[PDB]
Design a protein around this ligand. Structure first.
Ligand SMILES: OC[C@H]1O[C@H](O)[C@@H](O)[C@@H](O)[C@@H]1O
Ligand SMILES: OC[C@H]1O[C@H](O)[C@@H](O)[C@@H](O)[C@@H]1O
Ligand SMILES: OC[C@H]1O[C@H](O)[C@@H](O)[C@@H](O)[C@@H]1O
Lengths: 75, 248, 274, 248, 274, 75, 248, 274, 75
């Protein structure tokens, strides 16, 4: 049920954002629909809250032998 | 469970899209977070597909392709594992236990296809001598088909023979030496792309900056962002000096 | 004269989505670069006289970079080709010169940013949200990543074209060589850093096996000594060997095949570790 | 205990000197090591004053003012706390417990006075147009009076009403947000003085050295002494090169 | 001609003890700089013709540096003003140019030395001796600190004047611009270092809350990610914002007020941490 | 009592140092008195001996949020 | 045990070779790994000599001579200790306990001889004014004899009086101050050779590179190999710039 | 004309084995340098006219470097002396100039490599094998070390001569000064590093003795404060003092004697620690 | 006994290497004998195997007060 609700919200927001950008033109319809979708996912993420995963940054291809996690600095 | 023919066609289409996204690396249709959910949707519960994708993504982080170094190819793993879990009735842990051998197999397959496309490149060379642009367009977009079939064919073979455990046995054909040997080789092929770029640059008098960049990355804690900032600063200051430009 | 219509920029932008897709070990991403410039060459060289074939062959040369940050290079070469077709003389080595000069830094700072921080941050957010099993995970990852990819592609093409039409407007002021020089310096620096950071060679031949600290066993190998002298020395020597082989007009395909064979055989023989 | 009027006058004078030294930052009459001993001398035992000053100095180390970032102002704390201890008959620990809220209050007061002196600066601007040097001297030395009263007035109010615990209650008027908010703001106003200097330098082509100095301080263990040595070396070498000066 | 008597150097030295004392948020330490040069302007420009007003306005400009290392700048400007009043032509931007050029490095290495190592070493010695409660504590601190402060002030004025009367003796040899360029380079370097070292912005918005190591709880915030990308990135962006605002002729007082309001409000809203 | 003795010693030493510099001139009377005071405090410090405090060096304005102690390198 | 006269002559020859190798520092005949085995061979069992040499080498690692800083001179220790062990019938641990005082004594002796050879240097100066090359050859090869006797004489005295424990007593003549004072002095004489080279270079405008090399070694983890690479890179780039060479 | 026979290179190589052996505190390794060039001066200056004495005095000057990497300098000076005796004008400061320029870097990277990594690696292998007590220990060390020493000596002489006969073949193209400048830069850098790395001064005067951490006792000395300001500051000041003394034409022998006396006396007085 | 065997092996290998280089000349006799000796010690080292010693690299003159072991970085 929550997944279907999320899909409906995404559809409504994208349609509304496309409608808002109609006077600007076709080049602005995309800039409206994208904004609608982004607002949907942002609102959902804010409702969810924090997350229990390590969130890696500046990692490298550690699958060969390189260091793992943040700048390949972990052997 | 048994699979209806409509679901077979749908899983074929999803596998084709994931295969093409594996080489394009643009829309991330080959990442497990998307491929697993799509397979789950076309096969049954979205719940299990999403969960498998989420669990496998954390492993697949850092499966970058870096300049002729081919990563273990999350697409084939993320598709076949979820087909085996949702249809073959296995535990999520058991399916994710199969992620790594499947990744190695996909790595082998994509390496083979990337060597094959050299024929397409040479055909484009021949089409150049006639000045045929439409031939170039067809040659480029026709080399994606191979990458699509690369994932599509095994993902239909597995789906059609889900009532057997022979896939786990076929996974043991590649014993250990190639599973780990490919990563070891990829620990050195990262060099080749940079070597080709440097060879094409034809700037031998600027080579001191290469060594400077090497040792700086070996004995300091600099980021790559910091190294980019430093490199830009040295470029600007070198141009400010260098009397070749400051001529009266 | 001949000039690029607005409709011929979107055409370059749309075709750049399939930038890879013909990815070889021989000339990586080259056919994609020539494929995404077809709508331009179709306008600047409307006939097959001789300049069309030269223009096509000019772009079927080695070209490897991060797929997303290649739009600026596409725009810059669009501007250069427009000027060269209109008559202003840009040799042939200033086009390929600027292409190769910009290939370095953009691949050196594109990978550690897009395949580096940008993709796994969004992927980790989406994966963590997907552990509970809500659609917000995949949707978040997909939307957030593509809104960055599309933005950088489109606006990179636009900005590269606009800024490249100003580099040629003062031709003779020594701007192309300045830009090539600066790009080469930055690219060499970052590639030198990445060769050390992202490569790994391990030679596990035990040299000494002192046993103390009630069984710490303190094993030292050849790799330990080499890392004490200079970390990443073996990949540096391999880089120089590859450059020497490429000097002798050896096909890169055989170099890559040799690397694969060396890796597999060395791991089988037990002198390449992990 | 009660305080004789002569001691009130003496504590007023000591407070004025400490207040002026707070802004001058020259003789360090505002540091607790000196102010506490002076108050102890004029009030009674030098023993307790010296001990309080010694204990409070170790906290007040690193209460530097750095370019429009105002520190918590040791003067008001070091005066009022010792007045409360020697005259109000409190434990040394209890008095030093009041050092931090008093420091925050003094920080607020000195920020207000430093905004007020802008009127004096503009009056000096007006006096410039008449070429009146004596007016400039009077305007400069007349802006110290405000900084003296800033510490003198509360330090007489407290001394006159020592037979009450209302000061500890008035200390709770500034609840928590401004006590900690001022330090947080001071964590960013350090930037403003450097920004003003850089804006006045009008050297945009030397800005690469700024970024170079930034990242070097973020990923290395260099001192400020070492960074000064490095900066001097780069300045000398830049001048040695740079063909603008090496012209035949 | 007009020259500075010996008695007019002590006058500059004595008045420099009250260097601050009119310290504004608008033009920090500027009125002090004009106040400590009164005995010189009183001699070089004995009349109020027009050059007196120009000389006064020249020194009521922004001038911020460590109070103790400002004697060398006072001496250098004394020499420059002497030469300019005697007739040799020093523009107007070479006086303010050298002042601003020397402001940078002297504030960048003055604070970490005087407010840095020098004051707290003596203060710690005195405080430790004062724990027992002997007068040696405060006396030690007072005497040792003032014997350094007075020495540096007096001999900085003297040395700056003497060395500045040699920079102008070879005017036309390109020495003032060399000195300004070198001082600017060193100052920019040290200020860039100090912006990173001595600033602090903390955004405590929790992004992930993994719990492991039998309860280590491993909280990561937005500040953690930003510090992994580039430590001190937010203060760097704030520096550029302040420079942009000062370009637009915004009064610094409003910038400082805005900073105070932002800090207090952000801490109240709980998105500025500590 | 020790404090009064220290004050008397300081006065005597400053007076003696001023007297020693009389032939040099008023510009040397200060250089003599300062030397006397410095010798007094140095002799007292030598008699006291070591001290039980951390002795910080190259510290910064740690009151905002900066690192504390020796180069702001302590979080 | 007693020693035959032939063994006395042989140990004299081995001591002479070790003494000359101490100053030549070419064939490493003075390292314990070689001297101990040679003494063991000429005296008796090679087994004990090899073992003593192996044990003492691990101590003697890092007994480099660096530009007028004289190390503790492994030759005298490695010879006399094995003479005392093989002939004087002591435990290996007891003999190696004597390695350090013997090293200090040898350090003193070699410092004295290295001050003496200044007379030989001045004699060569005088021979230069006559243009006599054979005199220069004889003067150079005749200054080795002193370094040979430096080790040979005590190594014969010890061998002839092995039936007494007086050597351990004579080892206590140098009490503690010179044993440790010499190493402390050697902690500063490393500077002198570099100072002499820099003084002879007469390049004052390149002195900024000295300070640059100093602080870089104080706050970073760079090797000496890395510092050599960096120095070469800066030399090349300085020559590329520097308009003194890029003149039209 | 006069040229160096092949037999006169081996003669230089053979005599360079006794490169030290007359090692003074006054002119370290100088007589060895003049001794190893005797077979050359015996050919280029067959008579004692005046150039023989000048040639001899030219090489009895201060010359200190790592003994093994001195063959290249020997070869280079062989080439220079050959050209100068044949007539081409090289003066008396380009020979000593190049010698002193090459002394720096070769001693700065020769010691940490030969006395640094090369000798103790082989020595440790041999010593470990000798613990069991087999002849393989000493034999391994001896053979492996001498096969490197002899190779570097012989081929350094050969390569230095061959490369130095090309530096003079384009005399007037500004090559000698380029080489001297580059060698001086590299040498100054490495010597500055080694002065910090390989020196040690310790002043153990206790300043504070805080006691906490249930008895960690946290003693701090003058050396602690100095090391916090700048590690190795005292040896740097001593280097500058030695340079100043050598400027004043003080004999180095007295400097070394003073250093020995200072070390022994300071350790006796207890203010030089260890 | 093993030491005598090692000496005999060294002698045989050096003689054989010298004989192999006879046609090249006296300048190659040395290059043959050296190769023979090197092969002898290398074969012996390979037979012995690993070793129980710390194997130091890039050490300095630690006998004065300098750091000990690998770059003088150990106090
Ligand atoms: O970085 C170089 C670049 O090379 C190829 O185009 C692909 O492997 C990319 O993924 C990679 O980023
Ligand atoms: O450093 C800049 C300088 O600015 C102002 O003048 C005062 O805050 C000083 O304390 C500070 O040192
Ligand atoms: O490094 C300088 C050099 O000086 C002298 O020649 C000897 O002490 C050598 O051992 C040393 O290497």
């Amino acid at each position: 049920d929550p997944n279907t609700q999320l899909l409906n919200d995404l559809g409504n927001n994208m349609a509304w954002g496309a409608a808002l950008g109609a006077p600007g033109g076709l080049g602005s319809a995309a800039l409206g629909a994208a904004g609608g979708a982004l607002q949907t996912v942002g609102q959902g993420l804010i409702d969810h809250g924090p997350v229990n995963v390590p969130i890696p940054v500046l990692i490298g291809p550690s699958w060969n032998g390189s260091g793992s996690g943040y700048n390949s600095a972990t052997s | 469970m048994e699979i209806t023919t409509l679901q077979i066609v749908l899983v074929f289409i999803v596998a084709c899209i994931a295969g093409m996204g594996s080489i394009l690396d643009e829309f991330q249709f080959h990442r497990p977070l998307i491929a697993c959910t799509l397979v789950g949707i076309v096969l049954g519960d979205m719940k299990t597909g999403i969960i498998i994708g989420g669990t496998l993504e954390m492993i697949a982080l850092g499966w970058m392709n870096i300049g002729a170094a081919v990563a273990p190819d999350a697409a084939l793993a993320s598709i076949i594992s979820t087909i085996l879990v949702i249809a073959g009735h296995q535990s999520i842990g058991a399916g994710i236990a199969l992620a790594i051998p499947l990744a190695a197999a996909g790595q082998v397959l994509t390496i083979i296809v990337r060597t094959i496309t050299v024929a397409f490149q040479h055909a484009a060379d021949k089409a150049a001598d006639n000045g045929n642009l439409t031939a170039i367009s067809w040659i480029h977009v026709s080399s994606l088909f191979l990458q699509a079939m690369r994932v599509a064919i095994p993902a239909v073979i597995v789906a059609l023979s889900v009532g057997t455990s022979e896939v786990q046995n076929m996974l043991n054909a590649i014993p250990e030496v190639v599973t780990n040997g490919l990563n070891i080789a990829g620990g050195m092929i990262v060099v080749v792309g940079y070597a080709m770029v440097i060879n094409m640059m034809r700037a031998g008098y600027l080579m001191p900056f290469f060594y400077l960049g090497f040792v700086t990355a070996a004995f300091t804690n600099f980021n790559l962002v910091a190294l980019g900032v430093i490199g830009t600063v040295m470029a600007v200051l070198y141009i400010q000096l260098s009397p070749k430009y400051n001529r009266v | 004269e001949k000039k690029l219509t607005q409709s011929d920029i979107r055409g370059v932008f749309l075709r750049s989505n399939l930038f890879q897709g013909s990815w070889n070990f021989e000339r990586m991403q080259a056919l994609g670069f020539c494929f995404s410039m077809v709508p331009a060459i179709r306008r600047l060289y409307p006939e097959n006289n001789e300049a069309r074939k030269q223009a096509i062959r000019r772009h079927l040369e080695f070209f490897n970079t991060q797929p997303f940050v290649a739009a600026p290079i596409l725009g810059v070469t669009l501007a250069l080709e427009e000027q060269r077709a209109n008559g202003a003389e840009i040799d042939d080595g200033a086009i390929n010169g600027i292409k190769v000069g910009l290939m370095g830094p953009l691949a050196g700072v594109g990978d550690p940013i897009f395949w580096g921080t940008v993709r796994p941050v969004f992927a980790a957010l989406g994966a963590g949200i997907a552990m509970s099993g809500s659609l917000l995970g995949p949707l978040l990852f997909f939307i957030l990543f593509n809104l960055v990819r599309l933005a950088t592609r489109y606006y990179g093409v636009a900005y590269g074209y606009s800024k490249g039409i100003d580099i040629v407007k003062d031709m003779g002021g020594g701007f192309l060589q300045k830009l090539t020089e600066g790009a080469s310096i930055l690219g060499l620096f970052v590639m030198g850093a990445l060769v050390n950071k992202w490569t790994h060679v391990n030679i596990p031949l035990v040299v000494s096996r002192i046993t103390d600290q009630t069984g710490k066993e303190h094993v030292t190998t050849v790799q330990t000594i080499l890392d004490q002298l200079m970390p990443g020395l073996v990949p540096l020597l391999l880089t120089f060997a590859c450059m020497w082989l490429l000097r002798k007009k050896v096909n890169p395909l055989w170099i890559i095949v040799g690397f694969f064979v060396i890796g597999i055989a060395g791991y089988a023989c037990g002198l390449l570790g992990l």
